[PDB]
Ligand binder design. Structure first.
Ligand SMILES: *[C@@H]1O[C@H](CO)[C@@H](O[C@@H]2O[C@H](CO)[C@@H](O)[C@H](O)[C@H]2NC(C)=O)[C@H](O)[C@H]1NC(C)=O
Ligand SMILES: *[C@@H]1O[C@H](CO)[C@@H](O[C@@H]2O[C@H](CO)[C@@H](O)[C@H](O)[C@H]2NC(C)=O)[C@H](O)[C@H]1NC(C)=O
Ligand SMILES: *[C@@H]1O[C@H](CO)[C@@H](O)[C@H](O)[C@H]1NC(C)=O
Ligand SMILES: [Mg+2]
Ligand SMILES: [Mg+2]
Ligand SMILES: [Mg+2]
Ligand SMILES: [Mg+2]
Ligand SMILES: [Mg+2]
Ligand SMILES: [Mg+2]
Length: 550
């Protein structure tokens, strides 16, 4: 281009090299320059597999798109697939390259443009300005195709970190990861269903087990301890993702109950509806309010109460997910702003209860706690993020018509349930309100209560506050009235929010009741921590406990 002489040489290249095959020498006789000829030839070699038809080759040679592995690529894309700015090939900050002009002279390693000097299978790539990610591939258009090499993400990490190749090696608590190849680390990976596509390099954070929470690593302490690492995952609100019951856990460690979860002895098992199942459609009475009321006996047999031993005192709700594991909120156990830090032997639980106030010797059962597991991502300094805990009973509990576990949903189930046209349900003894407010007037209920609440669209729930709602929370409740406090502070603190599957007829815990502005302020919705990402954390906790035995 530009010079006349050059424009002639361009036409000759077209005639002899593009419309026809040419030799290096033929090419040189046309360009009359070793450099120019080497430059051309490297492209011509990169386009070996795309020599016909002519336009296919012309496109490949222009270099604005990747053909095959994209050694042909010569375009000006600056950024990684995840949006990280590419490091200059000539720089050594933050990474010091191993591939340069000298090692790969025909690769056109200029500025910080994505290239594929090493014929890497992920296509053109660059060293990144993120000191925790050495190299990453870029999203390049494919030649002759409405398509790109790898999907773009908007400055965030996809697939819950399963593509992550970086070198972050501390957990969110600043705990150093251990090496995956370390003896104790190998002993715990022994027979896990680790995806071999995830490379377990050094002690870098990885997600080899498909954990919905994201990347993690083992850390020093008790054998099997681990923690999650801070990556900026893409906002994936499960609300908006487009039969039978299959068990996830191992009964030897989870305990009994999963197979039969979510089917109540006194209702589903007798083919009887409870009094408010009939009002569970969002369309019920045009969607208008229906106030809470006394529960029927045994209509929420996974309900659990957490008590201080001395002074005897009701602390929190909780939920039964097997015969030995119980799910609640971490703030129930550890909340430094109230100087709260309860140990196992401070507490007990009561299961199968109906009356708050009475010892119900025919139905209720008392269990002690063996261990408490606070979620490793729990953070109270922020906004009660991952306000979740798991408790292990000292002895398993006996199931009965009043004591039965609830199901836990995975991601598919959760998206499915938030999107069928049914409300959710909160039951308890008003412990949230009692704990978090002065609760004047209306006393605490003496009998288990129930109310049903419709799920609220995430953008509407977002506009109901100036608080940032992470994708791990959701709102539920009826159209508020800014004149009235409404019923946005229902249930027990740490207690269950549940929904019934219209597909397999079982009850699933979708949420854990957390504190929300509803407790203090008009015009709000109730606020619930998602549980759908927890399964692989739980699975790892129940192995950590397997080790606890010696
Ligand atoms: C690209 O890498 C080469 C290979 O390591 C670098 O060349 C070496 O540089 C050291 C000095 O730092 C010399 O002592 C060696 O003799 C060189 N080895 C060879 C085989 O040349 C080179 O300097 C790097 N180039 C850039 C642009 O960073
Ligand atoms: C909550 O309190 C318990 C009990 O006081 C603390 O347990 C201590 O743990 C540290 C570190 O492992 C030990 O030095 C102490 O010996 C433990 N105390 C007892 C009585 O066993 C625990 O550290 C507290 N948790 C938090 C997050 O502050
Ligand atoms: C690429 O990088 C340049 C220089 O760093 C930047 O200013 C520009 O916006 C980017 N160009 C493109 C085409 O994305
Ligand atoms: Mg032509
Ligand atoms: Mg010729
Ligand atoms: Mg010809
Ligand atoms: Mg000649
Ligand atoms: Mg000739
Ligand atoms: Mg000539």
């Amino acid at each position: 281009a530009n010079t006349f002489l050059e424009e002639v040489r361009k036409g000759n290249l077209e005639r002899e090299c593009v419309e026809e095959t040419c030799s290096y020498e033929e090419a040189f006789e046309a360009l009359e320059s070793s450099t120019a000829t080497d430059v051309f030839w490297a492209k011509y070699t990169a386009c070996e597999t795309a020599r016909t038809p002519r336009d296919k080759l012309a496109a490949c040679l222009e270099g604005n798109c990747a053909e095959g592995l994209g050694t042909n690529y010569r375009g000006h894309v600056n950024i990684t697939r995840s949006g990280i700015e590419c490091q200059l090939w000539r720089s050594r900050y933050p990474h010091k390259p191993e591939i340069n002009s000298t090692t790969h002279p025909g690769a056109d390693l200029q500025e910080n443009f994505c290239r594929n000097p090493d014929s890497s299978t992920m296509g053109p790539w660059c060293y990144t300005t993120d000191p925790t990610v050495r190299r990453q591939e870029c999203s390049i258009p494919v030649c002759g195709q409405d398509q790109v090499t790898v999907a773009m993400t908007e400055q965030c990490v996809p697939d819950r970190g399963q593509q992550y190749q970086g070198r972050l090696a501390v957990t969110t608590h600043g705990l150093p990861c251990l090496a995956w190849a370390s003896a104790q680390a190998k002993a715990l990976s022994k027979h896990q269903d680790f995806n071999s596509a995830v490379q377990l390099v050094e002690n870098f954070c990885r997600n080899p087990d498909g954990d919905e929470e994201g990347v993690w690593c083992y850390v020093a302490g008790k054998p099997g301890d681990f923690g999650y690492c801070d990556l900026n995952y893409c906002e994936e609100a499960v609300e908006e993702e487009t039969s039978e019951y299959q068990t996830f856990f191992n009964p030897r460690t989870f305990g009994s109950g999963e197979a039969d979860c979510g089917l109540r002895p006194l209702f589903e098992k007798k083919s009887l509806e409870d009094k408010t199942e009939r009002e569970l459609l969002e369309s019920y009475i045009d969607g208008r309010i229906v106030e809470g009321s006394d529960a029927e006996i045994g209509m929420s047999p996974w309900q659990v109460m957490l008590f201080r031993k001395s002074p005897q005192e009701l602390l929190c709700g909780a939920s039964l997910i097997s015969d030995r594991w119980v799910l609640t909120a971490a703030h129930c156990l550890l909340y430094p702003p109230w100087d709260k830090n309860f140990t196992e032997n401070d507490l007990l639980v009561r299961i199968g209860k109906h009356s708050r106030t009475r010892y119900e010797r025919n139905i209720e059962k008392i269990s002690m706690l063996e261990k408490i597991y606070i979620h490793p991502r729990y953070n109270w300094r922020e906004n009660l993020d991952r306000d979740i805990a798991l408790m292990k009973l000292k002895k398993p509990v006996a199931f009965s018509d009043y004591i039965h576990p609830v199901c836990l949903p995975d991601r598919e189930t959760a998206a499915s349930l938030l999107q069928a046209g049914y409300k959710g349900r909160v039951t308890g003894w008003g412990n949230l309100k009692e704990t978090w407010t002065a609760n004047v007037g209306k006393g605490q209920p003496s009998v288990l209560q129930v109310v049903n609440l419709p799920i609220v669209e995430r953008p509407v729930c977002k506009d109901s506050t100036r608080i940032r709602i992470t994708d791990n929370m959701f709102c539920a409740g009826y159209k508020p009235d800014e004149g009235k406090r409404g019923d946005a502070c229902e249930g027990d603190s740490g207690g269950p929010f549940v929904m019934k599957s219209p597909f397999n007829n079982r009850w699933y815990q979708m949420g854990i009741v957390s504190w929300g502005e509803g407790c203090d302020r008009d015009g709000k919705y109730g606020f619930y921590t998602h549980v759908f990402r927890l399964k692989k954390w739980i699975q790892k906790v129940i192995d950590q406990f397997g080790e606890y035995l010696e």
